């Protein structure tokens, strides 16, 4: 069962002018990797290593448009992308260690206040490379930053060196001096200080460069080319299996404490990312105490709600080729749209403007491909205390996998096995209706609320008219029979109350906006679909205004509000963010997301501010 939703975050979406206005290019004489680093102050800075070598960008995640970016070029290419580089913050300063192709070792010293100030160019010899103590014959592809101001550097044929500028004797550092290395065969190897020897090495044990190690407290997780080997100065435990159909390659791997899930008592959680070309899959291992009672696999929705609404034509709220052109310009960030426009101009595809369909279809498919390429995964970062974040390839592109509520779990996992069954039957009938009928029914409900349909009409008369104007057309009568017979099995008022009263109705940001807007959009779109289906049931078979009076009233109310907020999401997401973040925040700038429950609580607070507004 999928328990996590993908939330695509384009840090430049709300503004109509990418890239950010302030960019700093520092010289020293598509994408490939991206990650995010946490500084001393409450701020996350991102760095990208695109187009192999000679590329070092930096930008703050919080203020990506107004905060400035730092492009650090490189004089000589590197022997390895993303693996030759260690970024660590020491004394309020980012230490950047790179081995170029010339055999030279460059140390970049980026102060914290520089990346956050509005300064254009600052003088100073921050760059200072080292020609000696390296040779052309022996080139190392890796570089690991030891905590006590040290850098270990491994080569191909099982050898290492230590940098003190030169002292000699996957990989991660257990405890303080214990370097747990990994080989190509593979087989792990421990180190210590005791810098000369190894506590224990691993045998092949057959019958029983990337990120394949993840340690947490006294528990290590390794990958066996797949078999998830576990190991708790001891080095021994039992491996677990995977779920694979085609060929997948792991991106990143993080072992963490448990998060809020719908499982029994557990002991550890294991976030693993896999990637097939452009597509990516996130999975979570849930392990009970002492790594023996359970080993559950939790899936996730590998695509956001926007991509699914654009693929399967489930969208209803969105509304000529000029209006559709603006809709496409708003549904994607200006960066994606400009990239698509440039790709089309290179191929010499002149727009046909008005009354054009080939051009709009080509623009749609090119935008889809561009966004799917932008969202290619490269690394994982833990946000807040337990928030999950995935850095995409292209800059200013990230994806948060949010914990799903009961409503969202019911929505994403329809096909898996009391209110859930009622919603399942409602959707089983509602899927048989074309989007035209659904839109006409929703517009009839809007007419009911606004007063365009007469108020002297009884609600039963209103629904008879809605049927005889929209549902009077041919719908499979056998589907109506199935729906009625299945609805006869439920206690309808009880589940209706459960849906309405409990389930539905209850430092610049910036980044809180980019996530909060999308999560609220997802929640309210699910609410809108469910409300449309319930009111469709009301229209199909007329019901007494007495039984579901307050029910139908609140239903029309919430449907009106959902439609209004979805249409306000269709255009000008920036001002929607500004209003929603000024209404609910003490500083009108939002809330800092520290845990899953806190994020869901803020989303529910926005939902409450929506459902209780003045009509």
């Amino acid at each position, epitope marked *: 069962m999928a328990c996590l939703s993908r939330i695509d975050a384009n840090l430049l979406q709300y503004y109509e002018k990418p890239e950010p206005n302030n960019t700093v290019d520092l010289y020293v004489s598509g994408s490939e990797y991206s990650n995010c680093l946490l500084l001393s102050n409450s701020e996350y800075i991102c760095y990208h290593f695109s187009s192999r070598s000679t590329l070092l960008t930096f930008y703050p995640l919080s203020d990506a448009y107004h905060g400035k970016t730092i492009n650090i070029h490189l004089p000589n290419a590197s022997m390895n992308q993303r693996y030759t580089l260690t970024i660590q913050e020491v004394e309020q300063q980012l230490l950047v260690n790179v081995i170029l192709k010339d055999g030279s070792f460059l140390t970049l010293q980026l102060p914290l206040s520089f990346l956050f100030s509005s300064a254009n160019t600052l003088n100073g010899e921050w760059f200072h490379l080292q020609n000696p103590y390296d040779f052309t014959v022996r080139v190392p592809h890796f570089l690991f930053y030891v905590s006590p101001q040290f850098s270990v550097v491994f080569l191909e044929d099982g050898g290492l060196l230590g940098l003190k500028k030169y002292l000699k004797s996957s990989c991660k550092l257990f405890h303080e001096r214990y370097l747990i290395v990994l080989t190509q065969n593979c087989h792990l190897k421990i180190w210590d200080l005791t810098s000369f020897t190894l506590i224990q090495d691993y045998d092949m044990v057959s019958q029983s460069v990337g990120e394949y190690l993840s340690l947490y407290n006294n528990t290590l997780v390794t990958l066996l080319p797949g078999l998830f080997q576990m190991g708790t100065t001891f080095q021994n435990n039992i491996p677990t299996n995977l779920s694979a159909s085609a060929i997948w390659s792991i991106v990143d791997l993080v072992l963490t404490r448990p998060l809020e899930l719908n499982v029994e008592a557990s002991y550890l959680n294991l976030i693993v990312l896999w990637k097939s070309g452009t597509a990516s899959k996130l999975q979570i291992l849930n392990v009970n105490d002492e790594s023996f009672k359970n080993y559950e696999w939790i899936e996730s929705v590998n695509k956001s709600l926007v991509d699914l609404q654009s693929e399967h034509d489930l969208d209803i709220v969105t509304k000529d080729v000029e209006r559709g052109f603006c809709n496409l310009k708003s549904r994607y960030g200006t960066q994606i749209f400009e990239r698509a426009q440039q790709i089309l101009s290179e191929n010499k*595809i*002149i727009m046909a403007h008005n009354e054009d369909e080939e051009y709009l279809a080509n623009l749609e498919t090119i935008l889809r491909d561009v966004k799917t390429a932008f969202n290619e995964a490269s690394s994982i970062t833990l946000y807040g205390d337990e928030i999950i974040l995935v850095n995409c390839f292209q800059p200013y592109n990230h994806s948060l996998y949010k914990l799903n509520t009961t409503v969202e779990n019911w929505f994403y996992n329809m096909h898996s096995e009391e209110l859930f069954k009622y919603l399942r039957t409602l959707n089983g009938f509602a899927s048989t209706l074309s989007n035209d009928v659904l839109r006409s029914i929703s517009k009839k409900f809007l007419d009911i609320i606004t007063g365009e349909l007469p108020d002297s009409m009884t609600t039963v008369e209103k629904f008879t008219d809605i049927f005889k104007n929209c549902l009077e057309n041919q719908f499979e009568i056998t589907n109506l029979k199935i729906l009625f017979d299945e609805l006869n099995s439920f206690d309808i008022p009880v589940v209706l109350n459960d849906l309405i009263n409990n389930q539905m109705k209850p430092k610049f940001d910036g980044f809180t906006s980019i996530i909060s807007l999308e999560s609220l959009h997802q929640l309210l779109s699910i609410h809108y679909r469910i409300t449309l289906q319930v009111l469709l049931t009301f229209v199909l078979f007329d019901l007494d205004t007495e039984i579901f009076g307050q029910h139908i009233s609140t239903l029309l109310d919430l449907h009106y509000k959902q439609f209004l907020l979805l249409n306000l999401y269709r255009q000008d997401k920036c001002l929607l963010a500004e209003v929603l973040l000024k209404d609910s925040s003490e500083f009108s700038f939002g809330v800092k997301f520290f845990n899953y429950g806190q994020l869901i609580a803020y989303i529910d607070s926005l939902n409450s501010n929506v459902y209780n507004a003045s009509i």
Partner: nanobody
Amino acid sequence: QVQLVETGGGLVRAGGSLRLSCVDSGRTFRVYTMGWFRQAPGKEREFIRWSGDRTYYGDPVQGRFTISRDKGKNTVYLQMNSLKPEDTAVYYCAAPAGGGVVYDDHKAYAYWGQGTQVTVS
């Protein structure tokens, strides 16, 4: 059945000035443009889309010819300053259908309106 007439051509000495015009009778769209292609006698037809959002000129006439459009209309003018014997050809309007391109002979749903012109020295 929209038409696409054009006038303004003729015979002039080298270095003179002419003014080609071309309008549409039918409604169609406010979208399709009118490529001012040319064809020399024996040669192939050679080289203001979407309300002047972008313009493209050929290399043999850049800086010498000037195209212009009226706002929200299907009218295309071509001020041809500094004419030379190399400009001696037959010029055509144009009108696309679906996705188009400014550098091909696939561009038009309807051109027509052929007109012969010459240049002496």
